[PDB]
Amino acid sequence: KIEEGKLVIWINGDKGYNGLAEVGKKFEKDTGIKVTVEHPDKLEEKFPQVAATGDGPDIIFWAHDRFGGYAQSGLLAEITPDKAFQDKLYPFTWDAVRYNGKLIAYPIAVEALSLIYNKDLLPNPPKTWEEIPDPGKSALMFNLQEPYFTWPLIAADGGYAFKYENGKYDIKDVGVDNAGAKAGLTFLVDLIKNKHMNADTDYSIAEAAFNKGETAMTINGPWAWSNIDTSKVNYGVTVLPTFKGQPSKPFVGVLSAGINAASPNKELAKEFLENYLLTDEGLEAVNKDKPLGAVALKSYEEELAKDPRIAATMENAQKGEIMPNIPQMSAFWYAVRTAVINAASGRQTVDEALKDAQTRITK
Ligand SMILES: OC[C@H]1O[C@H](O[C@H]2[C@H](O)[C@@H](O)[C@@H](O)O[C@@H]2CO)[C@H](O)[C@@H](O)[C@@H]1O
């Protein structure tokens, strides 16, 4: 319903929207242009619905994987920073938001899942996945409803999204049905079957458990840290357990800011991002609300790199793989989500599930 003269930003609920709003207020003072920060439910799936008929927000925040599918539908505007601006952010972060030669977004931060453990309850964290299942429910709790959390275990011994080869992603070469993904999932289902974990554990349940001091371990991102801080739990962040000597390989996501192609405030959006958001102060404001992880801007990243928790995020990142941004990621996530959920709940076996996932992605 139009939108000229003001900015409407969409960012997920788990990130620093109040922090981003302080940035909005700084822009506002100087420019006179109102900045509105919203966090709707399932904005990543809702963007395409609204953006298609020239609606929605001016700017959108999300991990880079969804962006390539957005780019291909003609929903994003081309971002055009000069080469001097480009030199401020790490080159690999620019590579993430590069679709078909064109920059479709500004890189903000690098996110990776880590092992979060209660130091008072468990002073020394388990080095392997196989030493977790012990006698009773005594174990870890993490979101099992979102494929993003169980991925690290599945990829650990061989699973892969899309075969990466010669710069291209073999879309017809999906690897969720090999023996590495089958072992990862069988291990997870065995945890559930042997009752050390519940199949309905979601984000909120898992978070509550750890913040209330009911669980000694959990798996989460840099955005989770704020909640644990206020909860007063003595926690440490470290590397993901190994599975059969192989490190867990988490999917590396780059929080990105894309600009709607229907937005009449294209230059206002551009000015907010380069002059206000992507500065030391800009990123500091958002980081205070809920941590971002490893930031794209070198200057602020250099200060942030000595923090022990960021160090662990990075180690997990370099042992993982950057997510593909192509348009086949959307269907990839539904296939894996359905596969993990079915298998854990007893709808079908590990072999049945994964085969179906493969088949639906390779169609
Ligand atoms: O579970 C699949 C889901 O994974 C990623 O979503 C992450 C997101 O990037 C993180 O920043 C954080 O919000 O949590 C999400 C997990 O619920 C992908 O970005 C997303 O496309 C995909 O659906």
UniProtKB/Swiss-Prot annotation:
GO terms for cellular component: ATP-binding cassette (ABC) transporter complex, substrate-binding subunit-containing; outer membrane-bounded periplasmic space. GO terms for molecular function: carbohydrate transmembrane transporter activity; maltose binding. InterPro entries: Maltose/Cyclodextrin-bd, SBP, SBP_1_CS. Gene3D superfamilies: Periplasmic binding protein-like II. One of its GO terms (biological process) is maltodextrin transmembrane transport. It comes from the Bacteria. CDD domains: PBP2_MBP (cd13656). It is found in: Periplasm. Keywords: Periplasm, Signal, Sugar transport, Transport. The keyword Nucleotide-binding does not apply. NCBIfam families: PRK09474.1 (NF007011). Belongs to the bacterial solute-binding protein 1 family. Part of the ABC transporter complex MalEFGK involved in maltose/maltodextrin import. Binds maltose and higher maltodextrins. The complex is composed of two ATP-binding proteins (MalK), two transmembrane proteins (MalG and MalF) and a solute-binding protein (MalE). This is Maltose/maltodextrin-binding periplasmic protein. It comes from Escherichia coli O157:H7. The gene is malE.
